[PDB]
Design a protein around this ligand. Structure first.
Ligand code: HEM
Ligand code: HEM
Ligand SMILES: CCS(=O)(=O)N1CCC2(CC[C@@H]([C@H]3c4ccccc4-c4cncn43)[C@H]2O)CC1
Ligand SMILES: CCS(=O)(=O)N1CCC2(CC[C@@H]([C@H]3c4ccccc4-c4cncn43)[C@H]2O)CC1
Lengths: 375, 376
C-alpha cells in the first residue's frame, strides 16, 4: 500500500472521502451565505452580507474535513464577492472579517487563499444514498454559484473522471517494486492495468455533454472559477485586507491542480514540468495549489527511477506496448479534452456580442505526451 | 544522503572533478569555446559557429561529458547571441548548434541556456589534485572575453557554494534528530549549519580581490544575461531546427543555486510561498537546477518543519541555534546587497532595472529576516 502520510484514499484517490457537509454552529453565518449564493448574488445582497460579517476565529474547525469544508465555503464566498453578478464588476479588496480567517485557514492547510480544484471538485460532493455507488445519479455538489451555472455537471463529472483515473494510483507501488526487483512480468501487468484505468477515465468524460451546457459554462461558471493571476481585471492581484498590505496574485482553478494526471505524467517520464517553458512553469506552479501531502507524493514519484528509461533500455516489445498504451490513453484523454474546449469555450466565445493561448497551452501538453511514445 | 540526489560530500551540489576535454569528435565545438575571447574580439565567432556541421550528441556517453558539452555549447550560445556585447544581437541560433544543444538540454532536463550549474558548478578544475579547493589552486574552464573577470566571479561563486554546502550533510541528522526527539543532536546540527553559512560569508569577501566592478558590469554581465523579459530579444531566441517559434529562457542566477534554496526550505523560510513575484521567480529557477537537485529540494519540503519543531519546544538553546542559521542567511543577503551596489548600481550610475533588482533582493532578504524567532 501507499503510505498514509500521502492522504490517498483506496476508492476516491486524491479526492476527500465522504466530505463534511455542515460546519459547527459557530460558523452558521458563513454557511448561510455559501448555501444561498445563487439568490444572494442575483439580488445584490451577497457583498453587503459579507461586508457585515463578524471576523470569526478558525480555532473551532477542529479537524481536517471541517477545515476543508470551511475552505470550500470561504472560497465560494470569495469568488462571489470578487466577481459579483459576473458582469465584469470586480471587488479589488476582500474585507478583513472574511479575508483574515480564510488566509489563516489556508496557511494552516498550506493552500493558497483562493478556490482550488481540491476545494470545488475534491471536497465539494456527497452521495444522495450512502449505500449506492459513486455515480452521477447518486451524487450532488455541496455548493454552486448561480442557478443554471451547470456547476453540478461540471464539478461532479470532473470528480468522476478523477476517481476513475485514481483507480490506477494503487498500482504505482507495484510499478516501482517491479523495477527494483527486476520483475518484467509484474511490471507489464501493472502498466496494462494503468492503461485500462486511463482508458476508463476517458469514457467517464463523455458524460460532460449530458450535464453541462456550453453557453452557461462559458458565460457564468467560467467567470466564478477564474482568479487573479495575470488577470487584467485585477492587474496586481487581490487585497486580502488585514492579512497582507499589498495585493496578492493567485491563479483560479485548473485541473492542472489535479494530482492524478500530474502523477501519471511523472510516472511515465513525460516530463511536463521540465525544460523552463511556459506550460511547464504553469503545471509546476499548480502543484502549490494541491494539498501538501499530494504535492509530496508527486515529489516522491519524481525522485524514483524513470519507468520510461527502464522500458526504453530493455528491448522488450511487450513492455514497450504496455508503456505506450499508458501514453496513448493520456494523449486520447487530452485530445478529447481539446475538443471539449472547442465546444465549451471557443464556440461560445465566438457567439458572444484568450482562446488561442488556452488551446496552445493544452496542445503543448498533449504534444509532450505524444512525444513520449516509444513506437 | 542517497546517491540518487547527486550531492557530493566535499563539493555538495557542484559537479566533482569536472571534465575538461570532450571526445575528439567534438573538437570543432571545443576550439570555439576555448577561443571565445579571441573569436569575439576578431569578429570571427559567428562565422565559426555558422560553419559548424551538425554533430550528434550520441558520442557524449556519460554525465560529465554531457555537462561539459552543455557548458561549451552554453558559452558559445551566449557569445553568438550577444556578439561583442555592444547591442549587435542574433535572434536565431543556427540549427547546427541549436539542435544538439537542445537535444542535450532535453537529455539533462535543463533549459537550453547557460545556467549556474554549467558556468559555476561544472566550470572548474584543480591545478594540483593534491592541494585543497582554494582560489589559487583552481581555474575556470571557459571565459567570454579577456579581462571579463569570469575566473574571479565563477570561482568565488563556487567557493561560496562549497563553503555553504559543507552544512548539507548535516540535513539528515536534523530530520533524524527531530523524528527521534534528539534535542542535543539537533542543537549541534543547527550550530554546524550556522557555522558553515557564516564561513560562506567570509569566503564571499574574496569577490573584491578577483572581480573589478567596471569589467563585471560592462563585459561579464552581458554574457550572463538571458532572453526572458529582455527587450533586446522581446520574444526570446529562435532555436533553429528544434522549435519554430522563439522561446524565452532566463539568464543565470544564483537563485538557481540549490544550497541557499535548500537552507531556506530547511529553516521554513518559505521563499516560494504566497502570491508575489520573488516567490514565482525563485520557484522558476528550480527548473534551471539539475533534476536530482530539484528533487532534493522538494524532498526537504516533504519532511516536518524544523521551524515549527523549534517554535514548539520552549528551549532557548534550540531557538538561538535556529536563529543563528537564519541570521547567517540574513547576513549573506545583506552583504550581497552591498555587492550589488558596488558591482551593478555604481557602474550603472557612472555610464554615459537596478531598482527592480534591489527590490527583489530586499524582498527575499526580508522574508529571511521575518523568519527570525527573536529580533536579530
Ligand atoms: C467544460 C469542460 C472543460 C473545459 C471547457 C476545460 C477547459 C480547460 C482549459 C481552458 C484548460 C487550460 C487552462 C487551465 O489550466 O485552467 C484546461 C486544463 C486542464 N484540464 Fe480542463 N476543461 C474541462 C473539463 C476538464 C475535465 C473533466 C478534465 C478531467 C480530465 C480536465 C482536465 C484538465 C487537465 C489535466 C488540464 C491541465 C492541462 C493538461 O494536463 O492537459 N478538464 N481545461
Ligand atoms: C559580482 C558579484 C554579484 C553580483 C553583482 C550579484 C547580483 C545579483 C543580482 C542582481 C541578483 C538578482 C537577479 C538574479 O537572481 O539573477 C542576484 C541574485 C542572487 N545572488 Fe547574486 N550577485 C553576485 C554574486 C553572488 C554570489 C557570490 C552569491 C553567493 C552567495 C550570490 C547569491 C545570490 C543568490 C542566492 C540570489 C537569489 C536571491 C536570494 O536568494 O537572495 N550572488 N545577485
Ligand atoms: C483563464 C481565465 S478563463 O476565464 O479563460 N478560464 C479558463 C477556463 C476555465 C474552465 C474551467 C477552469 C478549470 C477548473 C476550475 C475548477 C475546477 C476544475 C477546473 C478545470 C478543468 N479544466 C479546466 N479547469 C478553467 O480552465 C475557467 C477560467
Ligand atoms: C537581468 C539582466 S542584468 O544584466 O541586469 N543581470 C543581472 C545581474 C547578473 C549578475 C550575475 C548574474 C547571476 C549569475 C549568472 C551566472 C552565475 C552566477 C550568477 C549570479 C549570482 N548572483 C547573481 N547571478 C545576474 O544576476 C548579470 C545579468
Amino acid at each position: 500500500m501507499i503510505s498514509k502520510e500521502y492522504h490517498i484514499d483506496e476508492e476516491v484517490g486524491f479526492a476527500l472521502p465522504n466530505p463534511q457537509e455542515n460546519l459547527p454552529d459557530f460558523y452558521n453565518d458563513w454557511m448561510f451565505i455559501a448555501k444561498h449564493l445563487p439568490d444572494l448574488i442575483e439580488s445584490g445582497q451577497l457583498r453587503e452580507r459579507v461586508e457585515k460579517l463578524n471576523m470569526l476565529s478558525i480555532d473551532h474547525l477542529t479537524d481536517h474535513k471541517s477545515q476543508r469544508l470551511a475552505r470550500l465555503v470561504l472560497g465560494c464566498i470569495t469568488m462571489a464577492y470578487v466577481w459579483g453578478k459576473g458582469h465584469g464588476d470586480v471587488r479589488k479588496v476582500l474585507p478583513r472579517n472574511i479575508a483574515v480567517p480564510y488566509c489563516q485557514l489556508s496557511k494552516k492547510l498550506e493552500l493558497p487563499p483562493i478556490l482550488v480544484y481540491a476545494d470545488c471538485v475534491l471536497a465539494n460532493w456527497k452521495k444522495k444514498d450512502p449505500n449506492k455507488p459513486l455515480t452521477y445519479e447518486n451524487m450532488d455538489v455541496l455548493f454552486s454559484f448561480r442557478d443554471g451555472d451547470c456547476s453540478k455537471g461540471f464539478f461532479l463529472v470532473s470528480l468522476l473522471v478523477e476517481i476513475a483515473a485514481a483507480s490506477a494510483i494503487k498500482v504505482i507501488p507495484t510499478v516501482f517494486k517491479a523495477m527494483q526487483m527486476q520483475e518484467r512480468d509484474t511490471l507489464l501487468k501493472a502498466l496494462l492495468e494503468i492503461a485500462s484505468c486511463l482508458e476508463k477515465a476517458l469514457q467517464v468524460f463523455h458524460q460532460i455533454h449530458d450535464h453541462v451546457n456550453p453557453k452557461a459554462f462559458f458565460s457564468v461558471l467560467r467567470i466564478y472559477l477564474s482568479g487573479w493571476k495575470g488577470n487584467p481585471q485585477l492587474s496586481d492581484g487581490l487585497v486580502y485586507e488585514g492579512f497582507w498590505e499589498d495585493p496578492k496574485e493567485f491563479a483560479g482553478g485548473s485541473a492542472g491542480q489535479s494530482s492524478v494526471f500530474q502523477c501519471f505524467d511523472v510516472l511515465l517520464g513525460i516530463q511536463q514540468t521540465a525544460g523552463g517553458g511556459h506550460a511547464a512553469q504553469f503545471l509546476q506552479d499548480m502543484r502549490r495549489y494541491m494539498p501538501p501531502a499530494h504535492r509530496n507524493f508527486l515529489c516522491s514519484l519524481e525522485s524514483n527511477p524513470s519507468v520510461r528509461e527502464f522500458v526504453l533500455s530493455k528491448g522488450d516489445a511487450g513492455l514497450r506496448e504496455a508503456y505506450d498504451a499508458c501514453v496513448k490513453a493520456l494523449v486520447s484523454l487530452r485530445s478529447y479534452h481539446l475538443q471539449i474546449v472547442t465546444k465549451y469555450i471557443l464556440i461560445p466565445a465566438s457567439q458572444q456580442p484568450g482562446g488561442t493561448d488556452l488551446m496552445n497551452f493544452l496542445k503543448t501538453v498533449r504534444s509532450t505526451t505524444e512525444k513520449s511514445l516509444l513506437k
